[PDB]
Amino acid sequence: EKIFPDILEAIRNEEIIKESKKIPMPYFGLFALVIFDKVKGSETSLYEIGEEFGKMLSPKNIEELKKIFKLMNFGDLEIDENKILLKNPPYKIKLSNPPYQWVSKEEPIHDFIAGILAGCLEEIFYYYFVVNEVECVSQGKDKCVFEVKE
């Protein structure tokens, strides 16, 4: 599309993000649903799209990863940097006040966000992670909990 050049600049410009229109999450999620209906005739997943999305956000450090989530309005990420610098995986990342708080489901629903975390983390630390959501607000928990490996 013709608008795509302008989008990569926009995500680097915090003033554009702050001054831009804000769209309710449901419509955001409708977009994905509609495409996946015209992706199927071919196959990717939402985790994988999140991985590419987080690559593209390319945060500089964990603090910028936290700020980008607040900008996006995806909630408050808890990440222990001190543990990340020093200790070995698994790491654990919590997400408070995430999108789709109104959804009730047996299994965790934030696959897209898990991928985002995976791709942002490789952009910061320059090696590949896999991120798996093991608890979710969807199950009546207070926070989403994501285990981070490799």
Q: Is 99 in the site for Cl ion (CB under 5 A)?
A: yes
How far apart are alpha carbons 101 and 138 in whole angstroms? 7
136 contacts which partner out of Zn ion, a second copy, Cl ion, none, CB within 5 to 8 A by kind?
Answer: Zn ion
Question: What distance in Å separates the CA atoms of residue 133 and residue 148, rounded to the nearest whole number?
Answer: 9
Query: Can you tell me which of 12, 14, 16, 20 binds Cl ion, judged by CB under 5 A?
Result: 20
Q: Is 33 in the site for a second copy (CB under 8 A)?
A: yes
**Residues followed by a gap in the chain, C→N > 2.5 Å:** 40
3 binds, options Cl ion, a second copy, Zn ion, none, Cβ within 5 to 8 A by partner type: a second copy
For 146, the 3-state DSSP assignment is strand
Examine residue 21 and tell whether it contacts Cl ion (CB under 5 A): yes
User: What is residue 95's DSSP assignment?
Assistant: E
65 near a second copy, judged by CB under 8 A: no
Among 49, 136, 145, 148, binds Zn ion (CB under 5 A): 136
